[PDB]
Structure formats: C-alpha cells, structure tokens
Amino acid sequence: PDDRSWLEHHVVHQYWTARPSQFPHSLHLHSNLAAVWDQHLYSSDPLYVPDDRVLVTETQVIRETLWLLSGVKKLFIFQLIDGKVTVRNNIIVTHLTHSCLRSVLEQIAAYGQVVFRLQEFIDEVMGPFRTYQAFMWALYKYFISFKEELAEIEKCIINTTITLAIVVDKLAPRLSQLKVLHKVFSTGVAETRNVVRASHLLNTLYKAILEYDEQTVSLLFSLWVETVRPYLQTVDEWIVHGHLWDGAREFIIQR
C-alpha cells in the first residue's frame, strides 16, 4: 500500500508484461470491431478456438514504433526470431480485426530491420583500419539527427489525436532514404585486406552518387566526405612532406 496505489493511479505498467489489460473507453462498433467480428464468428460456430490475447492499448504502439525506428534496439512489441525484428501477433487492439495490425507492423518492422542492422554494426565497433571506422562515424552523424526528430515526436505522447497513419506519413521522406542506404552499403560490405574491403565500398559510393545525381544525393554526399577525408589528408602529406606515409599499406597506390 501507498506506493502501490500511487502506481495504480498514475502509472499503467500492465500491457508490455503478463498482466490483464483494460483501458477506460466508450466502445460501439467503429472501435470495438475486432470483438464484434469475434462475436460474429463465435455465433457462426467456427467451432470454438479461443482468442486468448492480452489486449494491447492504442497510443503505446505508437510509442513502440517511435522507439524502434529511432535507433534503440530490443522492445516488447517487435521481437526478433533469428536476429531479424518482426511483429508479434499475441497482442490485440480493440479494433482493426487483428489482421490490419499484422500488416502495418510488418511494414514498420521492415524499416526496423534496416536500422537494427546498422546500429548492430556501430555498436560492435566500441564493443589500423580508419575507413569503416570513418564510415560508421558518418553513419552515426546522420543517426543522431534522425533519432532526435523521432524522440521529439515521442515527447508529445507524454505532453493530441493519436493514430498510426499520421506518424508514419510524417516520416515518409526519411524512411524513403533509409531504404536507399540499406542497398548502397550492402554492396560496400560484401568483401580480405583492409584496402580491398575499403576499395569496393568507396567505388560503390562514387558510383551510387552518380545514379541519383532530390534529397537522397545530399544523404550519400554527407557519407562520401567522411570516408574520403583520410585519403586526402595522406595525399596532402605525400605532397608536402614528400614521403608517402600510410601505415599497414592502406593507400591504394602501391608505394
């Protein structure tokens, strides 16, 4: 008592854990739909097959999708099965018939896998080379801005109509570019030496800029600068200091 009651009032904590869930609400078919269809089915004699699910609430799905897309990993909604994030279907919203839910979270999960893989790569750097390191640095530089916007949206779900289709639509011209990066980098991560494994990546970069040469061009440019930055430094050094110094034969011109 007295902390438990304080909890029960101003805190919810019952839908991302194994507790019964309710939400105070005013049903009447347009938002009771899933239960309406369930009762229709049960009257229709399926035969039975119970629909025991824990009932998730609505706005908090929107908290989960902002968190997944922003860059942090491992949520309640959106679990992994082999290391690739996918929708869980053990939760039910009062409406949507539980089939639209699987689709909408599947497409958002398709974005979430893209950010999941990149954040996995960047986390496995902090637990010579200087190019992949120089590329994850540029990727992180884009990532902090991308995360800031989605976090800024997340604050107003504490501070306003709440629906799925607006918060995805507001992020459409970022989630478009997010898919492009997943194809540009995947061909620059294919493949031994630290100079071959940099060369196919950089050549992929210079080739993929000319394809789009909107907004995506500036996105690939901001990554281009921060990977050619080591090379130009050692080139300048080779000019004025005369000798070529690039340790472990990182320079593509054999000295």
Partner: peptide, 4 residues
C-alpha cells in the same frame, strides 16, 4: 588539408 586538401579536405578542408
């Protein structure tokens, strides 16, 4: 440098 050349970069800057």
């Amino acid at each position: 440098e050349l970069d800057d």
